[PDB]
Symmetry: D2
């Protein structure tokens, strides 16, 4: 009581490949774990310029930054100081598919992410290889316990240039590194936004706002 | 001027699950602007039903959804001509249902013609074993595609003995006339069986639904 | 044991709906069970002229007509005279999805099918509603036992007018009406063909050739 | 002169992660490309003993070793000496999902593979993490052209210890590194087998036999 301060820092490195093309990105940021807000700056270190839509990475760049109510177990805050990991599949409607992992540790006031990201089967003319995405719409993730860990599923949509949406289904498994208390079925509303970026996206400023709830009464 | 603050509902569903035919009729009423509704359902054929009644309930109308001013209400616009929907329901254990509803309006009463079909439910699964408790509340994601409205929702049935059984809904809503097309939005749901008899020949069913646009 | 002839007959009625549009079709045919060949003539009785590619229905119009090698168990011929039923989902790459059931009985030398077929979510501009399909490619179905019944999965593809293919995944459950010996994992090669039809498909002549095998040695 | 001999060699390195646990494997082998047979020895170099069923990896360890008839275009042999790459998703019935990539080059008479393999969401209690798999059944892959490259889809099944099967759907994209003749829709029968292995699977002898065909008749 309590290793989680109302303001905390973040450092990350992501190593990855999309359609066989390796890349690496590093980031530093800060957030307010209790208001469920956070932001960070990201730099492409390898594989620049990135030949695919930068949006497909942004949800990989931590649910501790989630405003939780008193009446809902917070699975992620409990997990610390030791931390937790997640595994995620991201299945796009045109047969594109990404899978990512994050190992999350804590070093004093700073969370440290080790991220692996991989994607394949994106069509050369699809909205990802042509960089035709605008942003992720807001979302509501559904979280439920299975086999003693936490699952989260969310229907995601990328707004497209020239209108319409491009759909993706996320399936995440969250794994506390130690015994914590398990939440009941609940929801997390999200909104992730790229607030600014250069032309090749080599530098990105990224924000997220997330709040948990129990849905309709 | 066809949508009165209090409306009635009449429906018939004809269907089959794992090749077993059945039919259900229902009467109900709701408050379209409050996004609340309820109804009484009676199994007319194929009773007693050999499968979890819960797979049928979401088939038994987004007219009954509370829409804000700032969000276009596709469903209230479609009347008096009305609209139809098509829906696939994909269960994590390979069970799959598809349903259709053709919705018309007669005076103050909505009329549903529903077809429901399901296959490949495992005999030892929670559907055929009837081990479901209720649907969790949900948030549906609605977006336009090819001039019509799509709605996708991550659904989950609570199970006897704990845990959940997941289902992915994909719905297409089709107005039977030209209507204004909404921006990407959400509909929170909560559907509940309030009462039923032992073998579910009689069911009282409630839904509460509200539209919104997510996190500012 | 002997309730099957080297030549047998078929009668069927299918009732169905695609995208909410009801229809009905009847058919009569004959086949050579032990050779795995059959053909039939089909007539639209209701809902004509069908507004969707007829091809989506054709596999719905009996594995009794499969040549089975002596060394593979034949679940299908073995089930008669009590017969069997099947349930099938057919998932198309564009979100279109059909499910169908067949209850198969035997009356003397004639199999009788009671078929229900339903499909939804076919896009208005897609190859099914726009009737742009040419034929099913031949296929190899994979059959395996689960929970004391027989499963069959097959990767299907419709050739398209002006090139390319439109993919569909079939998952079938076959259920004998009496206890039968269960087969080992095996394959059925298929080739289904519309040999002739009239302009709007009110009348169709349909052939299938099917042989079981156990793959590369 | 043809860069493809009747007998050729193979060298590979795979780097990967399953459920967030990294590993690396190297292999050397040889095969007869015009006969569609090949074999190789594999050694775990990092991450061993592998904590998951080795079986999930084996298909990631080259369609060149496929016997093509003369009447079917051979996308793979044509692609050399410049070679080709593939991307593959492998979707398991219990929500486990792997994606892999292979970049294939040619050095003299030795193919060189650079392989990335990633898998997530395999349940702790599943047959992959519990190592309850026996072998892959033989299979028939379906190959078709799309967007000027070659697609291959295959229904796979792992035989399980003490009965039954565990199903996986493969979707592969093959990309020649230069312009080659595109084939028409066809099939490849496969049979992959671990012929021998030591106890924790640090050392594996792996064989594959593959033949192309056009289906019935
Ligand atoms: K863009
Ligand atoms: K129950
Ligand atoms: K056509
Ligand atoms: K084993």
């Amino acid at each position: 009581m309590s290793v989680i301060k109302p303001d905390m820092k973040i450092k990350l490195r992501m190593e990855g490949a999309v359609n066989g093309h390796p890349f690496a990105i590093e980031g530093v940021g800060l957030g307010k774990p209790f208001e469920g807000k956070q932001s960070m700056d990201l730099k492409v270190k390898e594989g620049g310029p990135l030949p695919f839509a930068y949006d497909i990475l942004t949800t990989a760049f931590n649910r501790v930054f989630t405003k939780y109510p008193e009446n809902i177990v917070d699975y992620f805050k409990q997990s610390f100081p030791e931390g937790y990991s997640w595994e995620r599949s991201m299945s796009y409607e045109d047969g594109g598919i990404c899978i990512a992992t994050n190992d999350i540790t804590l070093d004093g006031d700073c969370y440290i992410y080790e991220i692996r990201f991989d994607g394949v089967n994106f069509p050369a003319n699809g909205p990802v290889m042509q960089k035709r995405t605008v942003k992720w719409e807001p979302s509501t993730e559904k979280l439920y316990v299975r086999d003693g860990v936490l699952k989260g599923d969310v229907n995601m949509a990328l707004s497209l240039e020239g209108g319409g949406h491009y759909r993706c289904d996320f399936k995440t498994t969250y794994k506390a590194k130690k015994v914590v208390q398990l939440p009941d079925y609940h929801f997390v509303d999200h909104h992730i936004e790229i607030k600014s970026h250069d032309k090749d996206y080599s530098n990105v400023n990224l924000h997220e706002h997330a709040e948990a709830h129990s849905g309709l009464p």
